[PDB]
Design a protein around this ligand. Structure first.
Ligand SMILES: Cc1ccc(C(=O)Nc2cccc(C(F)(F)F)c2)cc1Nc1nc(-c2cccnc2)nc2ccccc12
Length: 275
């Protein structure tokens, strides 16, 4: 019961499941309604779950209740006293950031894009400060509300090309490997959801990174933004910025917006000669 100290217990009579929107660890995820009704997403733990699954499920509910931040997905509450058990979160019409950007290519200003990154960074600074390592930070795990506010979430695995070398090589997941992932997310946002490293295979990505190659500048990208994402990709974990540094830089760039007008050179893959 203590694990749920920051959570609100919701009575099952207040919940209606409507459509399956995913598969959980041991159950389905539903779109539904919560008692004027509020649309919600509902992750269930179905009959037969193991002890480890229950510990992980209630632990997830407990940390989500603990988190209270503008840029972290909101937990409405939990059903733990009845079966099936449920984790109930807010629901976003705009959905996941990766698909959102790919469906809105070129529709936002540079300031809007950088504002999204500042929000993600603030949520990640909060998680890291709370001693929570995400391990799967990627645009597909970020929700976008109708104010363009980005909320860090974790929908479980669908991530070599988002993962820092030390996490791949020896399973060292820390806030600093999350920083590497954040740099990849910066590149996803500034490219409107391009696939990191395009068609390179997972092995080719790892070999390129080990050889010293890094993702090139997105088109029309502020110089300061590319500089920041590049420093997230330093091989040496200790040399990467902390999330506090990232938030501070992004905030200062937004608040002095002329700083974003200087653009990094873009390397064309294709030459078009015209008179
Ligand atoms: C129901 C639910 C339960 C848990 C989470 C979730 O983000 N958990 C989580 C776990 C660890 C750390 C964090 C984090 F990020 F730190 F906050 C969040 C999200 C959701 N919400 C959604 N899940 C899912 C989903 C889909 C497939 C598999 N699992 C969840 N899809 C959604 C679609 C639209 C709006 C919300 C959701």
């Amino acid at each position: 019961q203590a694990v749920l100290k920051f959570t609100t217990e919701i009575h099952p009579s207040c919940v209606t499941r409507q459509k399956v929107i995913g598969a959980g660890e041991f159950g389905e995820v539903y779109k539904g309604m919560l008692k004027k009704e509020v649309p919600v997403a509902i992750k269930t733990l179905k009959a037969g779950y193991t002890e480890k699954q229950r510990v992980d499920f209630l632990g997830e509910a407990g940390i989500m209740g603990q988190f209270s931040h503008h840029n972290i997905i909101r937990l409405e509450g939990v059903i733990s006293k009845y079966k099936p058990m449920m984790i109930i979160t807010e629901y976003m019409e705009n959905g996941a950031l990766d698909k959102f950007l790919r469906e809105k290519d070129g529709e936002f200003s540079v300031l809007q894009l950088v504002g999204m990154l500042r929000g993600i960074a603030a949520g990640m600074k909060y998680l890291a400060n709370m001693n929570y390592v995400h391990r799967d930070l990627a645009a597909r795990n970020i929700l976008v509300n109708s104010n363009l506010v980005c909320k860090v979430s974790d929908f479980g695995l669908s991530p070599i090309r988002w993962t820092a070398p030390e996490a791949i090589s020896y399973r060292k997941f820390t806030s600093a490997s999350d920083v590497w992932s954040f740099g990849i997310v910066m590149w996803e946002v500034m490219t409107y959801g391009e696939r990191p490293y395009w068609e390179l295979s997972n092995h080719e990505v790892m070999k390129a990174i080990n050889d010293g190659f890094r993702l090139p500048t997105p088109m029309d990208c502020p110089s300061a933004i590319y500089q920041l994402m590049m420093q997230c990709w330093q091989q040496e974990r200790a040399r990467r910025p902390k999330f506090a540094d990232i938030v501070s830089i992004l905030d200062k760039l937004i608040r002095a917006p002329d700083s974003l007008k200087t653009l990094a050179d873009f390397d064309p893959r294709v030459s078009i000669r015209l008179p």
